Design a protein around this motif. Structure first.
Motif, short mmCIF file in Angstrom:
data_model
loop_
_atom_site.label_atom_id
_atom_site.label_comp_id
_atom_site.label_asym_id
_atom_site.label_seq_id
_atom_site.Cartn_x
_atom_site.Cartn_y
_atom_site.Cartn_z
N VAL A 138 -3.78 14.51 -7.75
CA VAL A 138 -3.63 14.06 -9.36
C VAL A 138 -5.12 14.36 -10.02
O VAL A 138 -5.10 14.76 -11.35
CB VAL A 138 -3.65 12.32 -9.46
N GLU A 159 1.92 2.08 -3.27
CA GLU A 159 0.78 2.61 -4.21
C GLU A 159 0.85 4.22 -3.92
O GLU A 159 0.88 5.02 -4.85
CB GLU A 159 -0.50 2.32 -3.82
N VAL A 160 1.19 4.60 -2.60
CA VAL A 160 1.35 6.13 -2.44
C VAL A 160 2.64 6.78 -3.43
O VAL A 160 2.40 7.78 -3.82
CB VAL A 160 1.68 6.40 -0.79
N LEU A 207 0.95 -1.25 0.07
CA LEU A 207 -0.05 0.05 -0.03
C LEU A 207 1.03 1.29 -0.11
O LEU A 207 0.35 2.42 -0.65
CB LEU A 207 -1.08 -0.09 1.19
N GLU A 208 2.03 1.16 0.70
CA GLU A 208 3.02 2.30 0.58
C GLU A 208 3.64 2.44 -0.82
O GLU A 208 3.80 3.69 -1.19
CB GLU A 208 3.87 2.13 1.69
N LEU A 263 -3.58 11.84 -2.11
CA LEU A 263 -2.89 11.98 -3.47
C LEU A 263 -3.73 11.97 -4.62
O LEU A 263 -3.57 12.66 -5.84
CB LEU A 263 -1.72 11.00 -3.70
N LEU A 291 1.52 7.42 -6.98
CA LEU A 291 0.85 8.46 -7.25
C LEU A 291 1.72 9.80 -7.17
O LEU A 291 1.33 10.79 -7.62
CB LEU A 291 -0.35 8.86 -6.05
N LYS A 292 2.71 9.43 -6.44
CA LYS A 292 3.68 10.66 -6.25
C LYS A 292 4.29 11.05 -7.58
O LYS A 292 4.41 12.18 -7.81
CB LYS A 292 4.90 10.00 -5.31
N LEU A 333 2.26 10.61 -10.43
CA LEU A 333 0.97 10.96 -11.16
C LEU A 333 0.93 12.61 -10.62
O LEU A 333 -0.02 13.08 -11.24
CB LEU A 333 -0.03 10.27 -10.49
N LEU A 350 -2.67 4.90 6.17
CA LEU A 350 -1.99 4.83 5.15
C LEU A 350 -2.71 4.73 3.57
O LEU A 350 -2.45 5.47 2.55
CB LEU A 350 -0.98 3.71 5.03
#
Lengths: 33, 33
Positions: free
Chosen positions: B31, A23-24, A20-21, B27, A27-28, A30, B20
């Motif tokens: 986006v 995934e963050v 999941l981290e 995010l 998006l960074k 994106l 999280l």
């Protein structure tokens, strides 16, 4: 058995927040381009 | 005690991935605009 289930459970959620981290972090880019 | 520590541990990581996952959602707007 019981504690064995907990050991497999914590590792599971450890894997959950781990992926999941990641995934963050996706998006960074994106947001950053 | 031992299993009590596991119970508090899993809830901790449950909280980790919970908060999280909220981060991924933040995010999403960064986006989306």
């Amino acid at each position: 058995g019981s504690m064995k289930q907990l050991e497999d459970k914590v590792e599971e959620l450890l894997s959950k927040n781990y992926h999941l981290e990641n995934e963050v972090a996706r998006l960074k880019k994106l947001v950053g381009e």
